[PDB]
């Protein structure tokens, strides 16, 4: 309603003012080296856990028991979605770990190609996303997906996502080369057939405007795309 439209747009303008200066000070994509595969996979998963462990997360919104947290770092904007689903965490882990089945429920992943299967729990994908507001071209990503099972009780299943570079899939004029610093899921066992599904996205300069629109409340594509995940997991029990 009017009362919310006006105050929301004010919040969006402030966030743009703060993050107009995008961010090399931090490295988005990293060279892929089969020799450093174990550390690229370790640093990938380690980064996501440290993001979860940060303390200055602030709640922005809640809709039908689906929360939305945000974190205003000095250089980049991070958000995080929380949700509880009625599926076993182990089952949700196998579904959310294969990005090839992610276009089936996420509007933001148009196509997904598997470039190289490093090992059991690590792989390199080639992702393409539709053109967001203000572009004629879709943008593509070269992402390393690393998954790890929880070590102890209470620790989460982790699926990590980081952009990398490969000499075989270099930037092409048909797509815009996007780059995400660190994203992925975190799944907790909240009980028998219960799972707290969490999506984290640390930084993606190629979609800043898109994010600040959802955080301010002027849009609801995060919630739509995230409840589609809830519906994607429930059907595979």
Curated annotation (Swiss-Prot):
Residues 28-223 form the START domain. Signal peptide: none annotated. It is found in: Mitochondrion matrix; Cytoplasm. It comes from the Eukaryota. Induction: By cold exposure and repressed by heat exposure. Transmembrane segments: none annotated. Isoform 1 is predominantly expressed in skeletal muscle, liver, testis, stomach, spleen, lung and brain. Isoform 2 is predominantly expressed in kidney, uterus, hibernoma and white adipose tissue. Has an acyl-CoA thioesterase activity with a preference for the long chain fatty acyl-CoA thioesters hexadecanoyl-CoA/palmitoyl-CoA and tetradecanoyl-CoA/myristoyl-CoA which are the main substrates in the mitochondrial beta-oxidation pathway. This is Acyl-coenzyme A thioesterase 11. The gene is ACOT11.
């Amino acid at each position: 309603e009017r009362r919310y439209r006006e105050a929301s747009a004010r919040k969006k303008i402030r966030l743009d003012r703060k993050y107009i200066v995008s961010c090399t000070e931090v490295p988005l994509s990293v060279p892929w080296d089969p020799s450093n595969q174990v550390y690229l996979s370790y640093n990938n998963v380690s980064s996501l856990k440290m993001l979860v462990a940060k303390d200055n997360w602030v709640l922005s919104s809640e809709i039908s028991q689906v929360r939305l947290y945000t974190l205003e770092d000095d250089k980049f904007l991070s958000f995080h979605m929380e949700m509880v689903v009625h599926v076993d965490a182990a089952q949700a882990f196998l579904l959310l770990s294969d990005l090839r089945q992610r276009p089936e429920w996420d509007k933001h992943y148009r196509s997904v190609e598997l470039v190289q299967q490093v090992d059991e729990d690590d792989a390199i994908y080639h992702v393409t996303s539709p053109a967001l507001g203000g572009h004629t071209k879709p943008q593509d990503f070269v992402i390393l997906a690393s998954r790890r099972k929880p070590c102890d009780n209470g620790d989460p299943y982790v699926i990590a996502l980081r952009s990398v570079t490969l000499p075989t899939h270099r930037e092409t004029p048909e797509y815009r080369r996007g780059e995400t610093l660190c994203s992925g899921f975190c799944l907790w066992r909240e009980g028998d057939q219960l799972t707290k599904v969490s999506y984290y996205n640390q930084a993606t300069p190629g979609v800043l405007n898109y994010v600040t629109t959802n955080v301010a409340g002027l849009s609801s594509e995060f919630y739509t795309t995230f409840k589609a995940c809830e519906q994607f997991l429930l059907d595979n029990r």
